[PDB]
Amino acid sequence: MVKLKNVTKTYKMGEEIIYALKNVNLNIKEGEFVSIMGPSGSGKSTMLNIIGCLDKPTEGEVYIDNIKTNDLDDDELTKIRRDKIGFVFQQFNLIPLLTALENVELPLIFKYRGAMSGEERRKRALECLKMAELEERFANHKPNQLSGGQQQRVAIARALANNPPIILADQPTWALDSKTGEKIMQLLKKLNEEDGKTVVVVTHDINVARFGERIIYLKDGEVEREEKLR
Amino acid sequence: MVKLKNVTKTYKMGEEIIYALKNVNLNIKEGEFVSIMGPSGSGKSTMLNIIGCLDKPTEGEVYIDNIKTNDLDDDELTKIRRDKIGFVFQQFNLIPLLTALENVELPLIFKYRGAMSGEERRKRALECLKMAELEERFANHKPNQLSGGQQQRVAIARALANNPPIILADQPTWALDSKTGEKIMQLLKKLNEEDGKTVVVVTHDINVARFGERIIYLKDGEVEREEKLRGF
Numbered sequence: 001m002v003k004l005k006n007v008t009k010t011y012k013m014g015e016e017i018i019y020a021l022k023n024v025n026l027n028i029k030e031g032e033f034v035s036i037m038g039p040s041g042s043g044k045s046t047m048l049n050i051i052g053c054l055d056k057p058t059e060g061e062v063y064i065d066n067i068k069t070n071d072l073d074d075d076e077l078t079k080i081r082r083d084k085i086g087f088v089f090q091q092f093n094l095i096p097l098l099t100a101l102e103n104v105e106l107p108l109i110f111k112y113r114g115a116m117s118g119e120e121r122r123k124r125a126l127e128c129l130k131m132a133e134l135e136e137r138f139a140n141h142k143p144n145q146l147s148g149g150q151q152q153r154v155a156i157a158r159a160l161a162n163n164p165p166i167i168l169a170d171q172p173t174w175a176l177d178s179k180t181g182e183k184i185m186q187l188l189k190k191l192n193e194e195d196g197k198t199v200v201v202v203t204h205d206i207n208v209a210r211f212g213e214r215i216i217y218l219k220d221g222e223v224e225r226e227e228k229l230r
Numbered sequence: 231m232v233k234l235k236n237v238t239k240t241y242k243m244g245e246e247i248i249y250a251l252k253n254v255n256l257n258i259k260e261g262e263f264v265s266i267m268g269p270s271g272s273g274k275s276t277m278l279n280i281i282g283c284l285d286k287p288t289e290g291e292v293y294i295d296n297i298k299t300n301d302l303d304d305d306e307l308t309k310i311r312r313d314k315i316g317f318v319f320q321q322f323n324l325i326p327l328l329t330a331l332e333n334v335e336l337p338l339i340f341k342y343r344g345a346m347s348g349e350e351r352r353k354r355a356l357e358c359l360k361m362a363e364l365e366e367r368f369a370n371h372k373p374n375q376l377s378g379g380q381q382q383r384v385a386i387a388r389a390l391a392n393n394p395p396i397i398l399a400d401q402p403t404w405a406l407d408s409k410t411g412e413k414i415m416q417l418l419k420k421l422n423e424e425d426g427k428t429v430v431v432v433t434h435d436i437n438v439a440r441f442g443e444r445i446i447y448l449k450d451g452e453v454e455r456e457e458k459l460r461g462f
């Protein structure tokens with residue numbers, strides 16, 4: 001479902017060359033639940049961004065759902081992201097002037113597949129907020145009126161909106177207390193097992209990572225090791 | 231060193247009045263290390279913001295280092311903040327077009343009354359970054375050129391920059407791996423114990439909270455309970 005082939009991502013600063021990812025190889029099958037761990041700065045977000053088609057590798061190839069994404073133009077890339085990927089951003093990246101509900105509806109507007117009526121769209125957005133454990137009474141808050149953890153749940157709900165086959169979550173429980181975070185992880189487990197979604201979670205919480213079938217560890221931009229869990 | 235007396239903070243959302251905090255009473259002694267925990271949305275940030283003079287209660291009194299703050303103006307509160315408080319924001323609140331080093335120099339220079347040399351600006355700021363466990367090679371990166379956890383360490387360093395008597399930290403390890411986070415907490419312990427700094431940390435990590443001598447639990451905007459981690 002996801003393949004990274006000899007992927008490198010470099011940054012140039014002055015005369016210094018930085019390898020955020022260095023010749024990485026990764027193969028995530030359809031319906032797999034995979035967790036990604038490693039020290040702050042090891043390249044975890046870079047990797048997720050590349051999988052999520054939000055950044056392009058400097059060298060290497062990327063395949064999403066059997067589609068080579070490298071040489072695609074932004075129109076095709078936008079389409080692939082919207083169709084294939086639900087992305088939970090580490091810092092949420094909500095639209096400040098839209099309510100929580102509106103933020104979740106936004107992807108449904110541009111699904112570019114089939115049109116929903118307004119009622120159908122609002123109904124789906126609400127279902128996603130409920131799945132993401134956000135109380136309906138917060139649906140009309142704007143992001144600046146929500147706590148960090150409430151915002152995180154809006155970001156989670158938005159990722160689920162278009163019912164994508166692939167969920168990419170960057171530290172999706174960081175702003176949540178243990179109990180609420182556990183509910184989120186049980187949801188990902190359910191979507192993975194019952195709905196066959198491919199799930200990739202970056203995390204610093206070993207307890208979170210343990211929901212995955214395996215844990216991939218990065219270190220200084222390279223895959224250090226993998227631990228099989230099941 | 232910090233007192234909240236019958237502090238309430240409300241927000242009006244339509245015809246409904248929401249209580250972020252409700253009739254809370256809190257006394258934090260000089261040099262105490264206190265942790266605050268509680269469910270997402272229970273009022274922790276609001277509490278820390280009020281302690282940090284970043285927001286005012288709707289009702290009640292706040293005292294910082296003996297000074298009553300709840301009736302001060304924006305200008306006046308800023309002067310107290312700059313002198314007495316180092317604040318680590320939950321989402322960092324760094325300045326985008328400044329390097330990590332420059333971000334750290336801001337509060338240093340805003341508080342410092344005199345004229346600090348360009349070379350010594352860099353010197354103190356680098357020392358803050360090192361305490362915050364960020365490698366020197368990242369000093370010249372801008373926030374958008376850093377990972378989340380690297381940004382968090384810049385935010386931590388910035389809180390250190392004014393050598394404040396009070397450090398207030400909102401989930402200061404969330405973006406960090408366990409080992410790096412442990413170092414940050416060890417740093418807080420050292421500042422608290424060796425230098426007598428008053429430290430208040432909001433956290434969802436019980437291991438983090440245990441660095442405190444007390445844990446205050448919030449629920450629905452009120453103090454649910456208190457746990458004393460040292461004898462009395």
Ligand SMILES: Nc1ncnc2c1ncn2[C@@H]1O[C@H](COP(=O)(O)OP(=O)(O)O)[C@@H](O)[C@H]1O
Pocket residue numbers: 011012013018019020038039040041042043044045046047371374375376377378379380
């Ligand atoms: N735009 C950039 N320019 C230079 N270096 C960058 C840039 N973006 C990220 N990096 C660096 O790449 C590394 C990996 O970051 P990621 O955000 O990829 O790390 P992680 O998610 O594991 O914490 C970091 O050391 C970071 O400083």
Ligand SMILES: Nc1ncnc2c1ncn2[C@@H]1O[C@H](COP(=O)(O)OP(=O)(O)O)[C@@H](O)[C@H]1O
Pocket residue numbers: 144145146147148149150241242243248249250268269270271272273274275276277
């Ligand atoms: N500007 C605001 N307008 C309306 N409600 C707010 C606003 N800011 C915070 N709140 C609400 O106050 C409550 C507590 O906020 P917060 O202090 O951020 O909780 P915590 O830090 O424990 O997650 C939340 O329910 C939140 O939605």
Ligand SMILES: O=P([O-])([O-])O
Pocket residue numbers: 147148149150174175176177268269270271272274275
């Ligand atoms: O604030 P929070 O939601 O708890 O993170």
Ligand SMILES: O=P([O-])([O-])O
Pocket residue numbers: 038039040041042044045377378379380404405406407
């Ligand atoms: O630093 P980080 O990215 O959070 O790991």
Ligand code: NA
Pocket residue numbers: 044045090170171202377378
């Ligand atoms: Na990350």
Ligand code: NA
Pocket residue numbers: 147148149274275320
């Ligand atoms: Na908060």
